[PDB]
Ligand binder design. Structure first.
Ligand SMILES: CCCCCCCC/C=C/CCCCCCCC(=O)OC[C@H](COP(=O)(O)OCC[N+](C)(C)C)OC(=O)CCCCCCC/C=C/CCCCCCCC
Ligand SMILES: CCCCCCCC/C=C/CCCCCCCC(=O)OC[C@H](COP(=O)(O)OCC[N+](C)(C)C)OC(=O)CCCCCCC/C=C/CCCCCCCC
Ligand SMILES: CCCCCCCC/C=C\CCCCCCCC(=O)OC[C@H](COP(=O)(O)OCC[N+](C)(C)C)OC(=O)CCCCCCC/C=C\CCCCCCCC
Ligand SMILES: CCCCCCCC/C=C\CCCCCCCC(=O)OC[C@H](COP(=O)(O)OCC[N+](C)(C)C)OC(=O)CCCCCCC/C=C\CCCCCCCC
Ligand SMILES: Nc1ncnc2c1ncn2[C@@H]1O[C@H](COP(=O)(O)OP(=O)(O)OP(=O)(O)O)[C@@H](O)[C@H]1O
Ligand SMILES: Nc1ncnc2c1ncn2[C@@H]1O[C@H](COP(=O)(O)OP(=O)(O)OP(=O)(O)O)[C@@H](O)[C@H]1O
Ligand SMILES: Cn1c(=O)c2c(ncn2C)n(C)c1=O
Ligand SMILES: [Ca+2]
Ligand SMILES: [Zn+2]
Ligand SMILES: [Zn+2]
Lengths: 505, 48, 146, 48
C-alpha cells in the first residue's frame, strides 16, 4: 500500500492537474480499499476438500507472486550460465552437433531439471498474477464504465468515438447479468435507469442493461433464497459466457499479463531449443528497479531517437545519390584487378554500403572508399567526406547522445519537483509551508494531524463501515457528498488555522 | 430563488454569455457582459 | 601502511600510494564524486551491456559461426564462435572495444545468403552497444556533475 | 535550453493570469479560484 501511495503521489504531482486532484485522490482511495480487501482475502488463515485445497494453493501463489518472479529470474540466470558451456562439433558427442562440454557431467541433467522448473514457475507466475493483479484491473474497468454510464450517459446520450476500442469492447458487458462483479456498486444499473430512463425510455435502457423490469419490483417486494448444489453441472450452467469473454478481452489487452504470457511462451520454446531461454535474461529490465530507471532514460525520448535514426537514413541516402552520380570510381572494394567489386554500381548496393560501413566508420565513408589524391574531383570528394563525417558521425550521433542525457536530466528534474512540491505545500488544501511554519513545526503538525491524507482514507473506510442511522451530522454530510461524487467538502485553500486565526492567536 | 428558476435559461445561454473585466472610466474594475455569437465561438474553436 | 611495508618486498608496490591523490587533492575528490555519485547505475549499466552482448553471442553462435574465423592460415582455422564461452569472450572483449562493433572484427558478409540478417546484426550491435549504452554511461557522469 | 523554454512557458501560464498578471496563489484563496478567474473573469478568448 505504501508503494501504491508513492506511485499515486508521483503521478498526481507530476502529470495530474489541480482541478481533478481530489477526484484522483478519491479514486486512489477506492482502489486502495479494493486492494486491501484482496490482501485480506489472500492472507494466511470430495468437492469441498478439493475446493479448500484449490483456494489454499491460489492464495499461496498470490501471496508469493513476487518471490516466484524472482525465482524465475534466478532460474533463467542458472540456465544461461549452463548454456555458456555449450559447444558445436562435426562428430557426435555434414550435420553439426550441439552439446555441453563439462567435466562434472551433472550439468546436462541439471539443465533439464532447471528448464522444467522454469516452465513450471512461469505458469505459476501467470496464475498468481491472474489471482492477485487482475481483480484490480477488472475493478478499475468496471468502475470507469459505471461512472461513464451514470454521470455521462456514454451509451445513452452519447456513443463511443468508433476509435475507442475500450468503449467498443465495453459495449459487450452492459447487458451481462454480472456487469458489476468486482466494483462494489451493485445498483449501477438501477441508478442509470432512473436518471437516464425518462428521457431515453425505460424499456430501451432496460434492454441496453439487460434488466428485467417485471422482476425488478418483485425482488424488492419479497426475498428469494436459492441453494444450488456445488456440482460441476450447476457451476457450468451458472457461467456468464458474455461477461467471461469481455473479461478475457480486458485481461489479454492488459500489458503485464501479455508480458507474462510471452514469458511462458518463451519458456515453452526453451524445451524445443534450450537457447530460447536466453530471452528470459531480458527480464532483468522489468525486475531490477535501477535498470528500469536507467532504461527510462532511453525510452523517455524514444520517438525522437527513432526520428533521428530516420533523419540519418535520409541524409545517408542523399550522400548515396551523390556518390552514385559522381564518385562511382572510388567504390571498388576488391584488391584483385581481374575481379573488381564495385559497391556503387547500383543504388541499392551503394545505399547498403553507405548505411552499413560509412556510418560505423570512425571517420565516415572516406575511411572506407578509395583515396582521392590526384583526382580531378579531389576537392569535391574531400568536401563530400568531410561533410559526411561532420553531419553523420559528429552531429547526428551527438544528437542521439544528447537526447539520452536530456532524458536523464528531465527524469531527475521530475523526481526533484515531486519532492519539493510535497515538502513545500499541503497535498489537500494546497497552502504552502511558509504560512504554517509561522508556528513552530507548523507545516509538520498540519500535514501529520490536520490534513493528513491517510486520515481522509481512514475516514472514507470508517464512513463505509459505520451504520447510516448512526452517522453524525458531519458524517452524514460527507457521506452524501461521497455518494453524489461532490468533492467540495475537501478543504481547498482554507484550514482551521486560517478560519480561526484571530481566536487561535 | 430567481437564479434557481432560471437555471435552464442560464445553462442554455452559458456558451454565449461572454464576460470580461476592464478598468473603466470610474477608475474602478468593472465587469462587462456581452453576447458571443455561435459562429464566432466555432471559428475560435477551429484547430488552426 | 600495509602497502608501504609491501613496498620493501617489491618496490613497485609503492605505486599503489599514488592513488592517495584522490583522497589528498580536494579537486580530484570532487571530480571523482562525479563518477561515484551514480556508481550503482554505472555498474547496472555494465551488467546490462554484458547481458545484451550475451544475447548477441547466442545469436552469433546459433547462426553466424562461419564468420568468426580469425586466422589467415587456411590449414589452421581459428574459430572464435565454435563454443559459447569463447564466442562470449570474443564479443565482450573485441566487439565492445571496436569502433564500429563486432562487424568491424568478423568476416565481411557480402554475397552470403544471410547477408541482410548479418548486416542487421552488426548495425543493431553498433547502435545498442556502442552508441546507446556508452552514451548512457557518459550521460550518467554528466548528470552527476550537474 | 529548448526544454527549459517549454517548461517556463507552461509554468508561467499555470501560475499567473495572462491578462492581469496576478499570481494563482492569490486567486486560490477561494476553491478553484485561479481556474474560475482564468475561465470566467479574465479569459483572453473572451477579450477576443
Ligand atoms: C545534410 C545535407 C546532405 C548533403 C547531401 C550530400 C552532398 C554533400 C557534398 C558535396 C560535395 C560534392 C558536390 C558534387 C560534385 C560532383 C562532381 C562534379 O560536380 O563534377 C562536375 C560535373 C560534371 O558533369 P558531367 O557532364 O561530366 O556528368 C553528369 C552526368 N552524370 C551525373 C549522370 C554522370 O558538373 C555537373 O554536372 C554540374 C553539377 C551537378 C548539379 C549539382 C548536383 C550536386 C549537388 C551536391 C549537393 C549540393 C550542396 C553542397 C553543400 C555541401 C553539404 C552542405
Ligand atoms: C537489446 C536487444 C538485443 C538483441 C539480441 C541480438 C539480436 C539482434 C539481431 C538480429 C539479426 C539476425 C536475426 C537472426 C537471423 C538468423 C538467420 C536465419 O534466421 O536463417 C534462417 C533460419 C534457418 O534455420 P535452419 O534450420 O537452417 O538452422 C536452425 C538450427 N540451428 C540454429 C541450430 C543451426 O530459420 C530459422 O531457423 C527461424 C529463425 C529462428 C527463430 C528466431 C531466432 C532469431 C531471433 C533473433 C532476435 C529477434 C529480434 C530481432 C530484432 C533486432 C534487434 C532489436
Ligand atoms: C516478440 C518476440 C521477440 C522477443 C524475444 C524472443 C527472441 C526469439 C524470437 C521470436 C518468437 C519465436 C520465433 C519462432 C520460434 C519457433 C521455433 C524455431 O523456429 O526455432 C528454430 C531454431 C531451433 O533449431 P533446432 O530445430 O535445431 O532445435 C532442436 C529441436 N529439434 C531437434 C526437434 C529439431 O531456433 C534456434 O535454434 C535459435 C534459438 C536462439 C535464438 C535467441 C533467442 C533469445 C536470445 C536473443 C534474441 C532476443 C531478441 C531481443 C529483442 C527484444 C528486445 C526488447
Ligand atoms: C585492496 C587491494 C588493492 C589496492 C591496491 C593494491 C595493489 C596491489 C595488490 C594487492 C594486495 C597485496 C597482494 C599480495 C602481495 C604479496 C606479495 C606478492 O605476492 O608480490 C609478488 C610480486 C613480487 O615479485 P618478487 O618475488 O620477484 O619480489 C622480489 C622479492 N624477492 C627477491 C625476495 C623475491 O609482486 C610484484 O612483483 C608486482 C608488484 C607491482 C603491482 C602493482 C602495485 C600497484 C600498481 C598498480 C595496482 C593498483 C590496483 C588499483 C586498484 C584500486 C582502484 C581503487
Ligand atoms: N496532506 C498531507 N498528508 C501527508 N503528508 C503530506 C501532506 N502534504 C504534504 N505532505 C508531505 O508528504 C510527506 C509524507 O511523508 P512520508 O511519505 O515519508 O510518510 P510515511 O507515512 O512515513 O510514508 P513513507 O514511508 O511511505 O514515505 C511529508 O513530507 C509530508 O510533509
Ligand atoms: N487569462 C487567461 N485566459 C485563459 N487561460 C489562461 C489565462 N491565464 C492563464 N491561463 C491558463 O492557460 C491555460 C489555458 O488552457 P488551454 O490552452 O488548455 O485551453 P483550451 O481552450 O482547451 O485550448 P487548447 O486545447 O488549445 O490548449 C490554462 O492553464 C489556464 O489556466
Ligand atoms: C464511495 N464508496 C466507496 O468507495 C465504497 C463503498 N463501498 C465500498 N467502497 C469501496 N461505498 C458505499 C461508497 O460509497
Ligand atoms: Ca442516529
Ligand atoms: Zn492542508
Ligand atoms: Zn487576471
Amino acid at each position: 500500500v505504501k508503494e501504491s501511495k508513492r506511485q499515486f503521489i508521483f503521478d498526481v504531482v507530476n502529470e495530474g492537474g489541480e482541478s481533478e486532484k481530489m477526484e484522483m485522490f478519491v479514486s486512489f482511495c477506492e482502489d486502495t480499499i479494493f486492494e486491501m480487501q484482496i490482501a485480506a482475502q489472500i492472507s494466511e488463515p470430495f468437492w469441498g476438500e478439493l475446493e479448500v485445497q484449490r483456494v489454499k494453493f491460489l492464495n499461496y501463489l498470490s501471496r508469493n507472486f513476487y518471490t516466484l518472479r524472482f525465482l524465475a529470474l534466478f532460474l533463467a540466470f542458472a540456465i544461461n550460465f549452463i548454456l555458456l558451456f555449450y559447444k558445436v562439433s562435426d562428430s557426435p558427442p555434414n550435420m553439426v552437433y550441439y552439446f555441453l562440454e563439462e567435466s562434472t557431467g551433472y550439468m546436462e541433467p541439471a539443465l533439464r531439471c532447471l528448464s522444467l522448473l522454469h516452465t513450471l514457475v512461469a505458469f505459476l507466475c501467470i496464475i498468481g498474477y491472474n489471482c492477485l493483479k487482475v481483480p484490480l484491473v477488472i475493478f478499475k474497468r468496471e468502475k470507469e464504465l459505471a461512472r461513464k454510464l451514470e454521470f455521462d450517459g456514454l451509451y445513452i446520450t452519447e456513443q463511443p468515438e468508433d476509435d475507442d476500442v475500450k468503449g467498443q469492447w465495453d459495449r459487450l458487458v452492459l447487458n451481462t447479468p454480472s456487469f458489476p462483479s468486482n466494483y462494489w456498486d451493485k445498483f449501477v444499473k438501477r441508478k442509470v435507469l432512473d436518471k437516464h430512463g425518462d428521457i431515453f425510455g425505460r424499456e430501451r435502457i432496460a434492454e441496453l442493461l439487460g434488466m428485467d423490469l417485471a422482476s425488478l419490483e418483485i425482488t424488492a417486494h419479497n426475498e428469494r433464497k436459492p441453494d444450488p448444489p456445488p456440482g460441476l453441472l450447476t457451476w457450468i450452467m451458472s457461467i456468464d459466457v458474455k461477461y467471461q469473454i469481455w473479461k478475457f478481452g480486458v485481461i489479454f489487452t492488459d500489458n503485464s499479463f501479455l508480458y507474462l504470457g510471452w514469458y511462458m511462451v518463451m519458456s515453452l520454446l526453451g524445451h524445443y531449443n534450450n537457447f530460447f531461454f536466453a530471452a528470459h535474461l531480458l527480464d532483468i529490465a522489468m525486475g531490477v528497479k535501477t535498470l528500469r530507471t536507467i532504461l527510462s532514460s532511453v525510452t523517455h525520448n524514444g520517438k525522437q531517437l527513432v526520428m533521428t535514426v530516420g533523419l540519418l537514413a535520409v541524409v545517408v541516402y542523399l550522400y548515396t545519390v551523390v556518390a552514385f552520380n559522381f564518385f562511382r570510381k572510388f567504390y571498388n572494394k576488391s584488391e584483385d584487378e581481374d575481379e573488381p567489386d564495385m559497391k556503387c554500381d547500383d543504388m541499392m548496393t551503394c545505399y547498403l554500403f553507405h548505411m552499413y560501413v560509412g556510418v560505423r566508420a570512425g571517420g565516415g565513408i572516406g575511411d572506407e572508399i578509395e583515396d582521392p589524391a590526384g583526382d580531378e574531383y579531389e576537392l569535391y570528394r574531400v568536401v563530400f567526406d568531410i561533410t559526411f563525417f561532420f553531419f553523420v558521425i559528429v552531429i547526428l550521433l551527438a544528437i542521439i547522445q544528447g537526447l539520452i542525457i536530456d532524458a536523464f536530466g528531465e527524469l531527475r528534474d521530475q523526481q526533484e519537483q515531486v519532492k519539493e512540491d510535497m515538502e513545500t505545500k499541503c497535498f489537500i488544501c494546497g497552502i504552502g509551508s511558509d504560512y504554517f511554519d509561522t508556528t513552530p513545526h507548523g507545516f509538520e503538525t498540519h500535514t501529520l494531524e490536520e490534513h493528513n491524507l491517510a486520515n481522509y482514507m481512514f475516514f472514507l473506510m470508517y464512513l463505509i463501515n459505520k451504520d447510516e442511522t448512526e452517522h453524525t451530522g458531519q458524517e452524514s454530510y460527507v457521506w452524501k457528498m461521497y455518494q453524489e461524487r461532490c468533492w467540495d467538502f475537501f478543504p481547498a485553500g482554507d484550514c482551521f488555522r486560517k478560519q480561526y486565526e484571530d481566536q487561535l492567536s | 430563488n430567481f437564479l434557481e428558476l432560471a437555471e435552464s435559461i442560464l445553462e442554455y445561454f452559458r456558451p454565449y454569455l461572454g464576460r470580461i473585466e476592464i478598468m473603466g472610466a470610474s477608475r474602478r474594475i468593472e465587469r462587462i457582459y456581452f453576447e458571443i455569437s455561435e459562429t464566432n465561438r466555432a471559428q475560435w474553436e477551429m484547430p488552426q
